[PDB]
Amino acid sequence: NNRYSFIGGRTGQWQVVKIRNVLGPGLQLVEKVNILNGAVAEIPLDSAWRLQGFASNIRYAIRTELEALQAVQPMLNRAEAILAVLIPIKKSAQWWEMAQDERRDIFERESHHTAVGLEYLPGVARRLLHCRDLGEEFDFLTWFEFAPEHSSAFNELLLRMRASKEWEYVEREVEVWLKRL
Amino acid sequence: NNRYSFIGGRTGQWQVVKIRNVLGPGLQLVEKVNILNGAVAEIPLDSAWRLQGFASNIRYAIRTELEALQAVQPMLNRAEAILAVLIPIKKSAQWWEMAQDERRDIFERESHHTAVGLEYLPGVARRLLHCRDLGEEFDFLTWFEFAPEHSSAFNELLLRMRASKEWEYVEREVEVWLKRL
Ligand code: HEM
Ligand code: HEM
Ligand SMILES: [Cl-]
Ligand SMILES: [Cl-]
């Protein structure tokens, strides 16, 4: 199954440490996030919100970037990676109507997304889910996990991404910080 | 709603003229195709199959290409566009694991998909839907409609595309030919 669901409420494998409502309407604070590998139609009881998305193909990265990533990126579920952060993102209509060279140019040529992210590996593990195509309120679910040593660096990465040209198209962002139970 | 459904069976706005099972397991012949702008979970009565897909953002076209397309491409549902073809396509795992530069290059640099397709406009109208990300048996549903004067041309276009480098990655294909009721 390529589909993943995230349920904020009273049960799950993860404890909510905090939520930061960076841009746009926020998400309700909950005790726990429950993560599931499947679609969930039936909104669980005592649950405040459901996010979902799917794992998909590469949209921007070129072969050499892929090779560079594969050489250093960590797997998910390292025993040390007890902190995680879920970050939903929505981009503007003006971004989606742009052609594929335009978007590519803003993503790497101008914003150096891949080159910047590479500096935070192997400390940081990541997964990217897509959800615009499902009718969701957000366009993406981003997932990051790392050992506590790396929390500082991760915060530094967030402030850099948000200073890029790419982030000018971002109209909605929440940080859900988590601790593995 | 970005989601479109196509049910083969005994009702619909389109009459099946023929089905050609070009490559891989085919689709059951039926009398009609019903086309709905939403999901359909409830497998309709006396229906052989259901295909679905969503409209999405541009994946390969650059700005200059988009501009050429917009100069000439016809709208859907022109009075004279009484013939239609629905063509589901699946591409190989080996296609999907390639990077974004690699697929772009096979699609345009080697195959000239857009340049070739542009020679058949404005006779031919088209819609493109994606469905690998939904877990369908096909990766894409393609939709073409035109007046009968353009049938022979459309047939020439199919044979050109299928000789392309792109089409070496196609592992499943069906043409469903239709007539508007
Ligand atoms: C930690 C190191 C990071 C690396 C190595 C990295 C790498 C990448 C790469 C290579 C892609 C492109 C995937 C593709 O071609 O389909 C991507 C996409 C994305 N990344 Fe990152 N990333 C990192 C961190 C982050 C962070 C912190 C955020 C947001 C807070 C983020 C948000 C995104 C988004 C939203 C996309 C999808 C872009 C789109 O389709 O418009 N990434 N990331
Ligand atoms: C009639 C003129 C045609 C034009 C102008 C045309 C144009 C295009 C364009 C510009 C794209 C890229 C969309 C994007 O960047 O997201 C595309 C994708 C596609 N076209 Fe065509 N097309 C034509 C005919 C056909 C035909 C006859 C077929 C199949 C029999 C076909 C199959 C496809 C498929 C499968 C894709 C998606 C490729 C992918 O995302 O991997 N096209 N078409
Ligand atoms: Cl990823
Ligand atoms: Cl289209």
C-alpha A64/C-alpha A172 separation (Å) is 31
How far lies A27's CA from each of A92, A133, A159, B43, B158, in Å? 19, 21, 20, 36, 49
Do the chains contact at A65 and B1, CB–CB below 8 Å?
no
Find tokens 């993406």 and name the residue: A140
Report the chain A residue with the minimal C-alpha distance to residue B95: A57
Hey, what CATH class is B1-181 in? alpha beta
Inter-chain CB proximity B62 and A96 less than 8 Å: no
Cβ contacts (< 8 Å) between B54 and chain A: which residues? 133
Unique residue bearing structure tokens 């000439």: B72
Sorted by sequence, the CB contacts under 8 Å of residue A153 that are 6+ apart come out as: A120, A123, A124
Q: Do A102 and B63 touch (CB under 8 A)?
A: yes
Count of beta carbons in the 10 Å neighbourhood of residue B167: 17
The residue of B42, B101, B103 whose CB has the most chain A CBs within 10 angstroms, and thus the best one to mutate to test that interface, is B101
Residues of B in contact with A54 (CB under 8 A): 133
Q: A4: part of which helix (H) or strand (E)?
A: strand A3-9
CB A144 within 8 A of CB A121: no
Q: How far is the CA of A80 from the centre of ligand 4 (A)?
A: 46
Tell me if B116 sits within 8 A of B69, measured CB to CB. Answer: no
Give the ligand with the smallest distance to the CA of B59.
2
Q: By the 8 A CB rule, do B109 and B175 touch? A: no
**Experimental method used, please?**
X-ray
Task: Count CB atoms within 10 A of the CB of residue B83.
Answer: 20
Q: Do B133 and A56 touch (CB under 8 A)?
A: yes
* Resolution of the experimental structure, in angstroms: 2.7
**A49 strand-pairing partners:** A8
CB A81 within 8 A of CB A162: no
Amino acid at A128: L
Q: Which atom of ligand 2 is nearest to the CA of B158?
A: 27
Q: Select the residue of B3, B54, B100 nearest A59 (Cβ to Cβ).
A: B100
| Kind and range of the H or E run holding A178 | strand A170-180
With beta carbons less than 8 A apart as the criterion, state whether A129 and A153 touch.
no
Structure tokens at B25: 């397991």
Give me ligand 3 centre to Cα A164, in Å. Answer: 20
Q: Does A99 sit within 8 Å of B57, measured CB to CB?
A: no
Query: In whole angstroms, how large is the CA radius of gyration of chain A?
Result: 16
Query: No. of H helices and E strands in chain A?
Result: 5, 8
b/e sequence A30-56, b meaning 16+ C-beta within 10 Å: bebbbbbeeebeeebeebeebbbbbee
For the CA of A87, the closest atom of ligand 1 is 30
Q: Give the number of the atom of ligand 2 that is nearest the alpha carbon of residue A100.
A: 15
